[PDB]
């Protein structure tokens, strides 16, 4: 659904068509003007950062594994005559429709008997999904993956690509897959009895030399070398695929460009009348196009074990019954062609729709992981109460759409309760300790991180014990639309730390809430604060991120009693464009204000600019008003004359309109 | 149901997150301050008990057995229609919760030749009550096997008698076969053979019953725990962790306190031991068993309407020893030679070391109210904050005072205990000696300490009144009409484990009131007899 994913984008964000991606890492964000203030009994110290960049790093790598599951049939496409008043295939009108058609008379009785089983095999989501992945593999084919590259680095702990993804050879995305071609046979109209467990599709005119090569590779096993997101492992959809094309199927060309895959999709959707099938495939790919680079070192627990992708079995019986598909189809919603029409016009817009969906999910799974099991709406039972339909199993797209509904605070409506795609809530529901590997840089690591060893020499491979999952992404596109006090994503905020002159700089935060806001605002001001817990004896640093520049309470890496000693004569100025706290006395009052917002994207430590035309909000009415218009100007070549007009020179001629 | 069991705890007590349990026995109580004031014909006397510890004792030892039964489906084409009406994951979560607490508190020792109850005259060992047992730790008790966790791939026909939803899931489905008798390691049948890959709320309440078992108040209160109670585990079909300890203690206390009253109800009234659950429930369960029996007793205790969303009948049934017209034979060990005088023993002549048997006809109270102290006060327990007890002293002929009435005798020995005078009386009908100092832990006298259902007259020995604990109020010679007025203030909770202090660390309401379970409370209406209890509709 293009419509619901479009509304997630911010108001200030004005996207263009083309986006020239030339790397496997993008820092999307915005530039804002922060007017910071520090008030005290001595006086006020004002600062101003005119261009403050708050970013979330997003990569094109992520371990996924496809499995073939059984899903509901999508009945949108079949002629409206055979359907009854309630909206199910009234068998008796099917036998009537087949009888009054251009079918062979000896096949009518035997084909009608099979109809009861074969007509309820309508799900082309798996085919469209694979054909969409082939489009983006050939478009962004020049992106590279190095084996010994930095997945994450925060100064203390480092995590390499070798650690998370073993059995991984370095190669380009184009050179990753070597897809073998499945057989594309021609359906004989005079076949005695239809062959079930072999799908048959429709086609307009002649199957082109390149269309054979695309359909051949789409219905085949994906066995990748490099762990890419749009080239993950998928099982063999089918062995053989029939195509009811009276004009013969040309043999396989071998080569094809990304423009030829768009040609193949547009013919397949139009012939089969499968627009709702495409809408399902569009939302599936939106989840599993890009995966987020973790905010903290201990936020890598989400991407340790491979999340399963639920691909519904390829099943289509249109080739055997050409009569039942015509120009008057049955559809539930009137805006059922909107998702395809959006993709054909603006293919590269999927990148923006993808980051909008994963940012919405991973933000909400952040503040869902911090609720006790003894509650009404908890970790296990947040999907059941929200869903008001009848899906087969609460997995895939249902779990991701219900998290988006919680974030935006609106009602998401789909025409069919389809349960296909990636399932994210895997590591959460387990409710056990996860062992993430790490290579150390400094020697004073295991004070900060909950490490397995207490003394570790530099360059050693250690393990961190993560119990509660910290947030993987900070809200950026969904900044101050549905604000919570955990993230504290306000435009205006203030904190009041109360100290007396008798205290020699040392302040104890009994409250946990205002400790989080103090440590966060001090980092905007470019000050390196290092607090020490009095009960346990561990240490926390506000500088625990190089992207957002905020301090969340989950950076403590421990749930206990709150007694944080901060010594305010060991505060060090780290960044540029900073206010100085030289020597405070009395009550401190910190405050900031974010005024304006400008969309910015970075890649390879350089600005990535959006190019091409101005993207519009395509509605169903905007095309069918031109159908209402029809260009009703009678196609008659009316040539109008020009009267020559003489003036002073007479050498040169001058023509007038009347 | 957290919000239900959380309400049972007293208003003053708010427990912390963690609790490091390092034994098979925990005392829980409070340190109250008592301000007594005495008045009689001789004159007036005023005193004050500065620190008084009233506590019960709860253990992790209880013989239980699991049975697989068919229960209602929790609702929170041909094949789907048959399977949806039997979906229940309560039995799987039950075993998964038990595995959590075996690993956490997996350093608790059960010694076979240890004490269970010890008063001074009689003694019960763990050899008795639990035969077919050996010495083992909780982690060493179970050696669980693993069921096949297969992957569900396209398969069109669901295989029958296998649910579809590694080492944890494998062991949760397997058989439990314990060596030492432990509460959270009780015998359970095999759930399933294979497993393809509100229900939790049921399993949470179901474990709150089993987790802990009471240590009996007197030797007669061991009759409850002889016969193994059955835990009804539903059939498995599908198509602050440490706070549970406090909720469990709160639940089992409320049940065993109220069964003290239900046992004394005569079997010739509207509400009796047979027909008290059936009148209370206002739903449609499969059978009045398990949790429905327990939650009915909590409603009768607190005096509030308890409501669950689904009428689930799964968990331990306690009312088994109660529902049988037979005297129960508690096996005991003789410590002092004068044991047959006190306890109703078979052999009237005994020697220190002999193993004899005592007879129990009416089941006495197993626990005294501690957490549920003064939320609703009955005359039997007399658990008031403020009370004025008035009794008329019988004429002392030689050195003996005859108490013919039953109520007056209860009030007399209740006063003398609060003053701290160990009085010993002789029951004239039976010819056995009663003592007000029966229980040391809870500092109160119940009428069931006489150990004789029926009618009798008591001959109190006024010359041999010992002085165990003496405040300034305490007098030995009462004269005329005795008035005692006491006030209880300054409550503070304290827990003891292994004879040391255990410290805590860390738009429209669519009613839909047709299917929902509702449990109506009963109020005790006191009558002249005092020995018999009677229930009425409020």
Q: Which residue of A has its CA nearest to B156?
A: A70
Cβ neighbours of A560 in B, within 8 Å: 506
Q: How far, in Å, are A611, B59, B357, B503 from residue B497 at the CA level?
A: 74, 10, 31, 10
Q: Cα–Cα distance between A367 and B263 in angstroms, integer?
A: 51
Best of A196, A314, A374 to disrupt the B interface by mutation (most B CBs within 10 Å)? Answer: A374
8 A C-beta contact, residue A468 and residue A554: yes
CA A385, chain centre distance (Å): 24
**Residue A256 tokens, joined:** 């094809």
Kind and range of the H or E run holding A311:
strand A307-312
Beta bridge partners of A37: A46, A591
Q: Cα–Cα distance between B145 and B192 in angstroms, integer?
A: 13
Q: Which residue of A has its CA nearest to B2?
A: A374
Nearest to A3 by CA among A398, A359, A274, A283: A283
Cβ neighbours of A384 in B, within 8 Å: 76
Q: How far is A130 from chain B (nearest CA, A)?
A: 19
- CA triplet B342, B345, B347: central angle to 5 degrees? 125
Q: Cα–Cα distance between A631 and A523 in angstroms, integer?
A: 62
Q: How far is B2 from chain A (nearest CA, A)?
A: 7
Cβ neighbours of B198 in A, within 8 Å: 381
Considering only the beta carbons, identify the residue of B156, B200, B506 that sits closest to A380: B200
DSSP 8-state symbol, B243:
G
Considering only the beta carbons, identify the residue of B156, B200, B240 that sits closest to A372: B240
Q: Report how this structure was experimentally obtained.
A: cryo-EM
Q: Cα–Cα distance between B236 and A31 in angstroms, integer?
A: 56
Considering only the beta carbons, identify the residue of B2, B76, B153 that sits closest to A384: B76
Burial of A167 (0-12, 13-18, 19+ CB in 10 A): exposed
Residue A70 and residue B156: Cβ atoms within 8 Å? yes
Q: Cα–Cα distance between A78 and A325 in angstroms, integer?
A: 5
8 A C-beta contact, residue B473 and residue B36: yes
| Three-class secondary structure assignment of A226-239 | CCECCCCEECCCCC
Q: Cα–Cα distance between A36 and B336 in angstroms, integer?
A: 83
DSSP B54-89: EEEEEES---EEEEEE--------HHHHHHTTS-B-
Best of B153, B196, B238 to disrupt the A interface by mutation (most A CBs within 10 Å)? Answer: B153
For tokens 């979330």, name the residue.
A56
3-class secondary-structure state, position A22: coil
For chain B, first and last CA: distance in Å?
26
3-class secondary-structure state, position B159: coil
Beta bridge partners of B125: B115
Nearest to A420 by CA among A399, A390, A445: A399
Residue A313 and residue B154: Cβ atoms within 8 Å? yes
Helix axes A209-218, A258-272, angle to 10 degrees: 80
What Rg value do the Cα atoms of chain A yield, rounded? Answer: 30
8 A C-beta contact, residue B393 and residue B480: yes
DSSP 8-state symbol, A554:
G
Q: Give the experimental resolution in Å.
A: 10.0
Nearest to B217 by CA among B42, B391, B431, B444: B444
Q: How far is A321 from chain B (nearest CA, A)?
A: 24
Which are the contacts of A152, defined by CB distance < 8 A and separation ≥ 6? Answer: A158, A159, A293, A294, A297, A300
Cβ neighbours of B506 in A, within 8 Å: 560-561
Q: How far, in Å, are A215, A307, A351, A580, B362 from residue A290 at the CA level?
A: 25, 14, 8, 40, 73
Pairing of strands A25-34, A588-603: antiparallel
For tokens 């007036």, name the residue.
B44
For chain A, first and last CA: distance in Å?
53
DSSP-H helix ranges across B86-221: 90-104, 138-141, 167-173, 199-210
Nearest to A489 by CA among A600, A407, A569: A407
Which are the contacts of B106, defined by CB distance < 8 A and separation ≥ 6? Answer: B137, B138, B139
Considering only the beta carbons, identify the residue of A374, A384, A560 that sits closest to B2: A374
Kind and range of the H or E run holding B251:
helix B244-262
Q: Which residue of B has its CA nearest to A560?
A: B506
Count of other CB atoms within 10 angstroms of residue A365: 21
Kind and range of the H or E run holding A567:
strand A564-567
Count of other CB atoms within 10 angstroms of residue A525: 24
Count of other CB atoms within 10 angstroms of residue A286: 24
For tokens 């603006």, name the residue.
A346
Q: How far is B367 from chain A (nearest CA, A)?
A: 29
Q: Which residue of A has its CA nearest to B80?
A: A392
Q: How far is B171 from chain A (nearest CA, A)?
A: 16
Cβ neighbours of A69 in B, within 8 Å: 154
**Residue A56 tokens, joined:** 């979330």
Q: Cα–Cα distance between A48 and B106 in angstroms, integer?
A: 58
Task: Write down how long chain A is.
Answer: 658
Residue A68 and residue B153: Cβ atoms within 8 Å? yes
Q: How far, in Å, are A155, A213, A286, A386, B515 from residue A422 at the CA level?
A: 33, 28, 10, 19, 37
Considering only the beta carbons, identify the residue of B2, B154, B240 that sits closest to A68: B154
Pairing of strands A564-567, A530-533: antiparallel
Count of other CB atoms within 10 angstroms of residue B73: 14
Q: How far is B508 from chain A (nearest CA, A)?
A: 17
Nearest to A253 by CA among A173, A177, A181: A181
Considering only the beta carbons, identify the residue of A70, A381, A561 that sits closest to B154: A70
Q: How far is B169 from chain A (nearest CA, A)?
A: 11
Q: How far, in Å, are A382, A392, A394, B89, B199 from residue A386 at the CA level?
A: 7, 15, 11, 21, 18
Q: Cα–Cα distance between A148 and A658 in angstroms, integer?
A: 76
DSSP 8-state symbol, B522:
-
Q: Cα–Cα distance between A406 and A410 in angstroms, integer?
A: 7
Q: Which residue of A has its CA nearest to B17?
A: A560
Q: How far is B506 from chain A (nearest CA, A)?
A: 6
Q: Cα–Cα distance between A476 and A601 in angstroms, integer?
A: 12
CA B306, chain centre distance (Å): 20
Buried b (16+ CB within 10 A) or exposed e, B402-428: ebeebeebbbbbbbbbbbbbebebebe
The B-side interface with A (CB below 8 A) comprises 2, 76, 153-156, 198, 200, 204, 240, 243, 506
Burial of A14 (0-12, 13-18, 19+ CB in 10 A): exposed
Phi-psi region of A87 (alpha: psi -120 to 50; beta: other; left: phi over 0): left
């Amino acid at each position: 659904m293009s419509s619901l994913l479009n509304s997630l984008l911010p108001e200030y964000f004005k996207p263009k068509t083309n986006l020239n991606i030339n790397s496997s890492r993008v820092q999307y964000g915005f530039n804002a003007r922060i007017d910071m203030q520090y008030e005290d009994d001595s006086g006020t110290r004002k600062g101003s950062r005119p261009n403050a960049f708050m970013s979330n790093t997003v990569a094109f790598i992520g371990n996924y594994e496809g499995i073939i599951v059984d899903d509901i049939p999508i009945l949108d496409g079949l002629r409206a005559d055979i359907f009854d008043t309630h909206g199910d295939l009234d068998m008796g009108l099917v036998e009537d429709a087949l009888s009054k058609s251009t079918m062979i008379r000896r096949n009518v009785p035997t084909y009608t008997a099979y109809a009861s089983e074969l007509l309820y095999k309508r799900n082309l989501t798996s085919l469209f999904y694979n054909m969409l992945r082939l489009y983006y593999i050939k478009k962004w084919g020049s992106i590279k993956y190095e084996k010994d590259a930095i997945f994450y680095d925060n100064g203390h702990a480092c995590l390499l690509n070798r650690q998370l993804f073993p059995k991984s050879r370095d190669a380009s995305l184009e050179s990753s897959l070597s897809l073998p071609e499945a057989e594309i046979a021609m359906l004989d109209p005079g076949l005695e009895f239809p062959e079930e467990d072999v799908p048959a599709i429709l086609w307009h005119g002649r199957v082109s030399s390149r269309a054979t090569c695309i359909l051949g590779q789409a219905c085949s096993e994906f066995a990748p070398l490099a762990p890419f997101s749009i080239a993950h492992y998928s099982p063999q959809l089918t062995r053989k695929l029939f195509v009811n094309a009276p004009a013969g199927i040309e043999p396989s060309s071998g080569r094809y460009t990304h423009e030829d895959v768009k040609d193949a999709i547009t013919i397949l959707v139009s012939a089969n009348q499968a627009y709702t099938d495409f809408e399902a495939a569009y939302l599936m790919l939106a989840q599993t196009l890009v995966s987020p680079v973790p905010r903290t070192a201990e936020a890598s627990a989400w991407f340790i074990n491979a999340g399963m992708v639920n691909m519904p079995t390829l099943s289509c019986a249109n080739g055997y019954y050409p009569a039942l598909t015509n120009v008057n189809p049955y559809h539930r919603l009137d805006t059922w062609k909107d998702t395809l029409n959006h993709w054909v016009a603006y293919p590269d817009m999927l990148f923006y729709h993808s980051v909008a969906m994963i940012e919405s999910c991973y933000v909400e799974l952040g503040n869902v992981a911090r609720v006790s099991d003894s509650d009404a709406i908890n970790k296990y039972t947040f999907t059941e109460l929200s869903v008001q339909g009848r899906p087969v199993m609460n997995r895939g797209i249902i779990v991701d759409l219900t998290l988006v509904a919680m974030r935006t605070g609106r009602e998401i409506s789909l025409p069919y309760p389809v349960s296909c795609g990636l399932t994210r809530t895997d590591a959460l529901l387990q409710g056990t300790e996860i062992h993430v590997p790490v290579v150390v840089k400094d020697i004073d690591m295991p004070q900060y991180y909950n490490a397995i060893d207490k003394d570790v020499i530099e360059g050693q491979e250690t393990v961190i014990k993560v119990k509660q999952l910290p947030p993987a992404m900070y809200p950026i596109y969904t900044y101050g639309i549905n604000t919570t006090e955990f993230y504290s994503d306000h435009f205006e905020d203030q904190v009041q730390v109360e100290m007396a002159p008798i205290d020699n700089g040392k302040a104890v935060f009994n409250d946990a809430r205002k400790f989080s806001k103090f440590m966060s605002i001090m980092r905007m001001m470019g000050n390196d604060v290092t607090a020490t817990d009095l009960v346990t004896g561990r240490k926390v640093s506000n500088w625990a991120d190089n992207s957002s520049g905020r301090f969340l309470y989950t950076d403590v890496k421990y749930e206990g009693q709150t007694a944080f000693l901060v010594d305010m004569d060991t505060v060090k100025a780290r960044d540029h464009c900073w206010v100085s706290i030289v020597d405070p006395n009395g009550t401190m009052n910190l405050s900031y204000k974010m005024t304006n917002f400008r969309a910015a994207m970075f890649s390879r430590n350089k600005p990535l600019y959006m190019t091409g035309g101005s993207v519009r909000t395509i509605a169903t009415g905007n095309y069918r008003d031109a159908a209402e218009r029809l260009r009703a100007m009678d196609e008659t070549l009316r040539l109008k004359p020009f009267k020559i007009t003489e003036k002073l020179d007479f050498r040169v001629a001058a023509y007038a309109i009347p």
